[PDB]
Amino acid sequence: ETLNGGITDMLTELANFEKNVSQAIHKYNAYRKAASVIAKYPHKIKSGAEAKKLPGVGTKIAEKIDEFLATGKLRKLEKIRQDDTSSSINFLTRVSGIGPSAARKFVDEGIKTLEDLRKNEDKLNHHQRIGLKYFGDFEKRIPREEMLQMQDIVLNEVKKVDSEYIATVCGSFRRGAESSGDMDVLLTHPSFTSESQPKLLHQVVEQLQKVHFITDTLSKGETKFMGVCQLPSKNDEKEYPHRRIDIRLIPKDQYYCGVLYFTGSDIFNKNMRAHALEKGFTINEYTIRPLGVTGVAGEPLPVDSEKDIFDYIQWKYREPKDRSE
DNA sequence: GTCGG
DNA sequence: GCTGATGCGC
DNA sequence: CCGACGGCGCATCAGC
Ligand SMILES: *[C@H]1c2c(ccc3ccc4ccccc4c23)[C@@H](O)[C@H](O)[C@@H]1O
Ligand SMILES: [Cl-]
Ligand SMILES: [Cl-]
Ligand code: NA
Ligand code: NA
User: Fold this and answer.
1) Is the CB of A133 under 7 A from strand B?
2) Is the Cβ atom of A96 within 7 Å of strand C at any atom?
3) Which CATH superfamily hosts domain A1-83?
4) What is the effect of changing residue 76 to R/A?
């Protein structure tokens, strides 16, 4: 962290400006990738040339590293930071529901701070109001211990609605992470499959609101719910912060590919999709399909467990804790 | 911005 | 009223 | 040189 923190902080700040102000999503991802690869580099970079050897670090970022190393700053970043409009646009996007487009619109009309947002509710859609309401809570991380308590509530209420449901809390949490940014829940039911009900998800969301676990709804459809939840506070104890929770309803026959996919990590999934193709298989979020000699993907293969997927590509079943790569 | 056909 | 496009989060 | 860069569900907008 102390090794190249200056560089990675610089790249990430540049990343945010590209996304939020210039609306250049590809440059945003480029800078992030450069920041990541450098974040892992087990040596203190002495020059851009050294950094350029890393995949994702090109000529431009090399030049920027040289400037930073010799001056401790980046002229363009110092300048953009002092820019009233750009810094405000960049800031507003921290509100969930306010993307680069809305942030630009707001700033163009003189709305530049949370306080300005607070006095202009009529100009915010439902999602943005909630994002504003929980601005601070949403930026806080979730200790694993709270995630465990959160899980207890979800599995219990899901089972209470129908004991045939199958719920799995995925994300880094499933891999054993010490803290999470949110709670991602994958849900299925035997009556729901690819080729075969709107209330399956609704009934669960409803029960979670009944025991006051879910406090707000950002979006809700027949297959995906996105909202806010909160653990009940202990006697005379301080209130827990509101948290982001997503609940996905997935066809049973696609459930395990979903759990695998949503457990990650991202690097693991890529390494698995690669090995999958090597054995003549195509693995995506939904299914695993056989690849013909001419490259034509056949029908979806039977999946009844996470392991089943590993068997197809002849790989040793790895537990989420070891799925970091 | 970086990579690679 | 509807259909497709856009913004957004992830 | 120049296109790719996992996109998918839902809310809301743009346009008929
Ligand atoms: C993929 C990608 C990114 C960011 C978030 C995100 C979250 C979920 C899914 C699901 C399916 C496809 C893509 C994603 C992503 C980006 O950072 C990345 O450049 C890709 O677009
Ligand atoms: Cl200006
Ligand atoms: Cl498919
Ligand atoms: Na490089
Ligand atoms: Na935002």
Assistant:
1) no
2) yes
3) DNA polymerase beta, N-terminal domain-like (1.10.150.110)
4) No effect on 5'-dRP lyase activity
